[PDB]
Amino acid sequence: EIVQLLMEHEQTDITSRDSRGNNILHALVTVAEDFKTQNDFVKRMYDMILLRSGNWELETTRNNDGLTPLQLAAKMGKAEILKYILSREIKEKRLRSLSRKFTDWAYGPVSSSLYDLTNVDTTTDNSVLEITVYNTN
Amino acid sequence: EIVQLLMEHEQTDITSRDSRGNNILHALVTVAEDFKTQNDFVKRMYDMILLRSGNWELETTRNNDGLTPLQLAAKMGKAEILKYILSREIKEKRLRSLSRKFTDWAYGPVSSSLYDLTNVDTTTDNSVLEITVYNTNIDNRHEMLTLEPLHTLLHMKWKKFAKHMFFLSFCFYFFYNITLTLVSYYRGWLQLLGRMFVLIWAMCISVKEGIAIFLLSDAWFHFVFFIQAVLVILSVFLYLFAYKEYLACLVLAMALGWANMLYYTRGFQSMGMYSVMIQKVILHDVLKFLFVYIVFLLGFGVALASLIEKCPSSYGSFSDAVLELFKLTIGLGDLNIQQNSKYPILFLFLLITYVILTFVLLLNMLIALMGETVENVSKESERIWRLQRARTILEFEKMLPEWLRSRFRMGELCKVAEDDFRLCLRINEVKWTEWKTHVSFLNEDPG
Amino acid sequence: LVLAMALGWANMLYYTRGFQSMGMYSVMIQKVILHDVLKFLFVYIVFLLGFGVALASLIEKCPSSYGSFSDAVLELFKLTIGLGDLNIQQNSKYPILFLFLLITYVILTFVLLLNMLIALMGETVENVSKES
């Protein structure tokens, strides 16, 4: 409720980066320890804030370590939130652009989804598939 | 309800001690067998009576055995009630002084509680940490040392002083045993440097072991360290004495020392449970196999000594025949076609029956083992290791000088209530499950 | 050259990791040789080097079956396999202690082999498979 109140005001800067460089989404990635520990409330807030502000900027921005929050979720050992980020199906047609999983072929029980490999398929500097494999910590 | 009625009357004496010396709380400690047996109603009554009479007297008083009900809960094997007594958070500000766990630093999901180490931190005559460790009659100490303050006290004492003392003692023993081997393998100017230290350290171990052996599967090793030093000092006496029987006790002391160095593998994190496995299995599973194997040895020995003595020979007297059978179970004794024997077919049949019975007996020790390993063995190993470490930590805790223990002095004096002024232990924790606006807190600025 | 050979035939185990079924097998080799066996090996070496100086102290009375230290350690390692023929104590000061000390070596080696098997049985059920 308080998060909705703070998003309602025009004075609020959603995209504000802190001293460490993290916007709000990087922080939510920082905190999301585990399902049994937290009960996955962070995933809900990650959904709600993006659906509140329809943009790619928040995922676009980087902390001082130079990482998008997808790449931060991969660098840290955050799995339950990555399963959400890496496959999003937004139903609303106005904010449907922000989805990363698209169904294009559904006829019935058979359907083929369509994932986004933008920062994932090792075609960039450090993709998710590179980080999650080459990270020993 | 009736307990409330009886507390309502002014004629009631809450603090009345019975013939045995127990007030009401000692009694409730006496009865509290287990959770599944009782459903933990005793804990509720322990709470209700203290909240009815706000005092420290009831916990202060002692039975004729001279024990506070905390110490009584520790002496008896009462765990579920001790987890309650040892960490109480009373919310009421008027009776908040009677709590033993205080939260002083809560900001959000992160918070550090603050336990009371008054009668717990081995700074008194017999603390809880002393009783629960040195009491053998409990048979439930696995669940006693995992409680909130005690577990961390053991970790802290290990991190501060017991690790270094243990490693240092291991080092001295290692140097000692190597000097013993360097003396015995080459058997004078180097002996003047070595043997003096050897005799001094042998006398030291023997004195310590004879001192602590009079006050007592936990004491076995400590019984062996004495026998080793006895053998060493005996061999050093018989070195100056003119005899040949000194080397025997010397090398037996050697082999016993290299067998005793298994003791110090118990302090390691990973290798400790391994040595505990050695101990438990050699104590229980193998000793059943060994006697029932010896009886077959001594039966078939007289059997074969009865047959093959017909023409005085491969299998000679009894001792040689038993030795040949023991050569056989390994594969060393070459099977000889029966010669100088009355009846060779019975000879061979009786021997093959020995082979088969030994094989199925080895098989069954393996079987009982497989059955043992799955659940009980692992839990038993972990429990024994934790208990052993706890025993060692408190053994070294009493070796230190008087000023050294006061120098370490785990805990800090916190300001609680108007003037609690009690030694406390700080433990930081993180709780994401329950969200509660923090009403009861001691310090406002979280440091 | 020959050490490089043997090391190459030991390194070809690396490429068994790409196979579907044989891969988890080599991972089992690695995990067990790393964790379960290495505990057994040092605690076996220490008995070797204790009983070696012991037997070299006894059987050196008349310079001989068990000679210098290296030969005695070698004979003990012959014994744990079954290769070293057990000799009745000769050229020895005291044969009964000789035989007793050797049988104690046999029994301690046996129970130690037993315990590595035990910790192994405990390891295999759930954690080992998932780890592999």
Numbering used by the authors:
A (entry chain B): 276 to 412
B (entry chain A): 276 to 462, 480 to 508, 518 to 613, 620 to 754
C (entry chain B): 551 to 613, 620 to 688
Kindly provide excerpts from the paper associated with this entry.
TRPV3 is most abundantly expressed in epidermal and hair follicle keratinocytes where it plays a key role in the maintenance of normal skin physiology. In contrast to other thermoTRP channels, TRPV3 sensitizes, rather than desensitizes, upon repeated stimulation with either heat or agonists. The TRPV3 channel, like other thermoTRPV channels (TRPV1, TRPV2, and TRPV427–30), is a fourfold symmetric homotetramer. Each monomer contains an amino- (N-) terminal cytosolic ankyrin repeat domain (ARD) and a domain-swapped transmembrane domain (TMD) comprising six transmembrane helices (S1−S6).
We determined the structure of full-length, human TRPV3T96A, hereafter simply referred to as TRPV3, in the closed apo state to ~3.4 Å using cryo-electron microscopy (cryo-EM). Extensive screening of various TRPV3 homologs and mutants identified human TRPV3 containing the point mutation T96A as optimal for structural studies. Characterization of both T96A and wild-type channels confirmed that the T96A mutation did not significantly alter the ligand-dependent gating profile of the TRPV3 channel. Third, we previously proposed that the presence of π-helices in the strategically important S4−S5 linker and S6 in TRPV channels likely acts as transient flexible hinge points that facilitate channel gating. Indeed, apo TRPV3 possesses a π-helix in the S4−S5 linker, whereas S6 is fully α-helical. In the apo structure, where the S6 helix is entirely α-helical, two pairs of interactions are present between S6 and the S4−S5 linker: one between residue N671 in S6 and the backbone carbonyl of Y575 located in the S4−S5 linker, and the other between the hydroxyl group of Y575 and the backbone amide of M672 within S6. Together, these interactions between S6 and the S4−S5 linker stabilize a straight, α-helical conformation of S6. Second, the selectivity filter (SF, residues 636–640) of TRPV3 is lined with backbone carbonyls, whereas the SFs of TRPV1 and TRPV2 are occluded by hydrophobic amino acid side-chains, such as methionine. Similarly to the SF in TRPV4, the TRPV3 SF is sufficiently wide (~7 Å) to permeate a semi-hydrated calcium ion. First, the high quality of the TRPV3 EM density map has allowed us to build the most complete thermoTRPV CTD to date (residues 707–754), a region that was not well resolved in the cryo-EM structures of TRPV1, TRPV2, or TRPV426–30. Notably, a thorough reanalysis of the apo TRPV3 datasets yielded no evidence of structural species containing symmetries lower than C4.
